[PDB]
Amino acid sequence: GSMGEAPNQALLRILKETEFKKIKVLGSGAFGTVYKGLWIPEGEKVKIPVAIKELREATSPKANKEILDEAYVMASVDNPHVCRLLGICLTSTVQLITQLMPFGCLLDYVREHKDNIGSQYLLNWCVQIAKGMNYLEDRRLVHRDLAARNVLVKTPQHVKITDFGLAKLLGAEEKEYHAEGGKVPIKWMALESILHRIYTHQSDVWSYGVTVWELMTFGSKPYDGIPASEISSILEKGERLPQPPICTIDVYMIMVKCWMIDADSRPKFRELIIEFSKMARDPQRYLVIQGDERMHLDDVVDADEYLIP
Ligand SMILES: COCC[C@H]1CNC(=O)c2c1[nH]c(-c1ccncc1F)c2Nc1cccc(Cl)c1OC
Numbered sequence: 001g002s003m004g005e006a007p008n009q010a011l012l013r014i015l016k017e018t019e020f021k022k023i024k025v026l027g028s029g030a031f032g033t034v035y036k037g038l039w040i041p042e043g044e045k046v047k048i049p050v051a052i053k054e055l056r057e058a059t060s061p062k063a064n065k066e067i068l069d070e071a072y073v074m075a076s077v078d079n080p081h082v083c084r085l086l087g088i089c090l091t092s093t094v095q096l097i098t099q100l101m102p103f104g105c106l107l108d109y110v111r112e113h114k115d116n117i118g119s120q121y122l123l124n125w126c127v128q129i130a131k132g133m134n135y136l137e138d139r140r141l142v143h144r145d146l147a148a149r150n151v152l153v154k155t156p157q158h159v160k161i162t163d164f165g166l167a168k169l170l171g172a173e174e175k176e177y178h179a180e181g182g183k184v185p186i187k188w189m190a191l192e193s194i195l196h197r198i199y200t201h202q203s204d205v206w207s208y209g210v211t212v213w214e215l216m217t218f219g220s221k222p223y224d225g226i227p228a229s230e231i232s233s234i235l236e237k238g239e240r241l242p243q244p245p246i247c248t249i250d251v252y253m254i255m256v257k258c259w260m261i262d263a264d265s266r267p268k269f270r271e272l273i274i275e276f277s278k279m280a281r282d283p284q285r286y287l288v289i290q291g292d293e294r295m296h297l298d299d300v301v302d303a304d305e306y307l308i309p
């Protein structure tokens with residue numbers, strides 16, 4: 001239509017290599033390498049636990065291009081349920097720096113605490129992920145990699161969406177991103193994304209549906225044992241992930257609506273906030289979980305208390 005673009009006045013913060021003490025590697029995979037460490041901003045009397053991400057690519061130019069694309073997207077994002085970029089470090093391979101999420105990724109968390117996770121926790125996570133995704137939709141950001149492995153656990157009551165490696169900014173009243181044939185996790189992708197490389201907020205809703213399924217199955221692998229090359233044909237025949245045992249029809253119906261062929265028929269993130277919030281008020285009416293009732297979960301400053309103008 002006629003709507004233009006406003007200036008992006010986000011501040012990119014450059015942090016000195018020498019203000020960081022890497023304690024340990026947290027993990028390595030397709031995301032690159034993530035380290036744990038401690039940030040001590042020279043001027044203040046403050047110590048801030050951080051995570052540090054480097055990419056692992058064929059050459060340094062490619063790695064630096066892709067990591068600065070991810071810094072660009074994240075610099076502009078400020079929500080309690082989305083990872084906040086604290087800054088970058090201009091080592092040879094550029095690094096991103098964020099607040100340390102000490103419990104790690106929600107996929108491993110639910111697998112590790114499977115016998116201790118009640119309905120209140122599971123519905124509250126679904127609410128928080130939908131809030132984060134609704135925020136990204138309002139910023140015209142399509143994440144394109146929403147999965148339980150890309151949700152981090154600050155505390156059992158507080159999760160954040162991470163990994164902006166595939167994220168794209170839509171122009172004002174632009175509806176779609178058309179991709180150019182890089183690797184994309186097929187078992188979390190909308191059917192139009194597999195067939196036509198079209199990505200929308202409504203394709204992120206499909207991924208949200210698979211993420212909820214991963215949580216409600218305590219971290220099962222979707223389409224377990226099925227090769228990626230068969231998923232397209234399975235979806236086109238009308239097959240979907242099965243109803244998790246703990247799920248009432250109310251919860252499974254939400255997941256199924258996320259996996260409808262008509263992208264505009266799928267729920268909006270703003271509707272998923274309302275639905276999961278309603279269910280979180282009476283959690284044992286919506287999820288039927290064995291032993292639900294009887295299971296619990298220096299100058300060091302939390303980065304959410306260290307605010308940068
Ligand atoms: C070892 O983690 C495996 C999942 C991996 C998958 N993909 C990620 O992107 C990521 C992962 N862990 C963490 C992470 C964060 C905060 N605390 C702990 C952690 F592990 C991630 N974010 C991250 C890390 C460092 C800097 C920035 Cl700007 C980050 O946000 C994009």
Ligand SMILES: [Cl-]
Nearest residue numbers: 030147149185
């Ligand atoms: Cl994967």
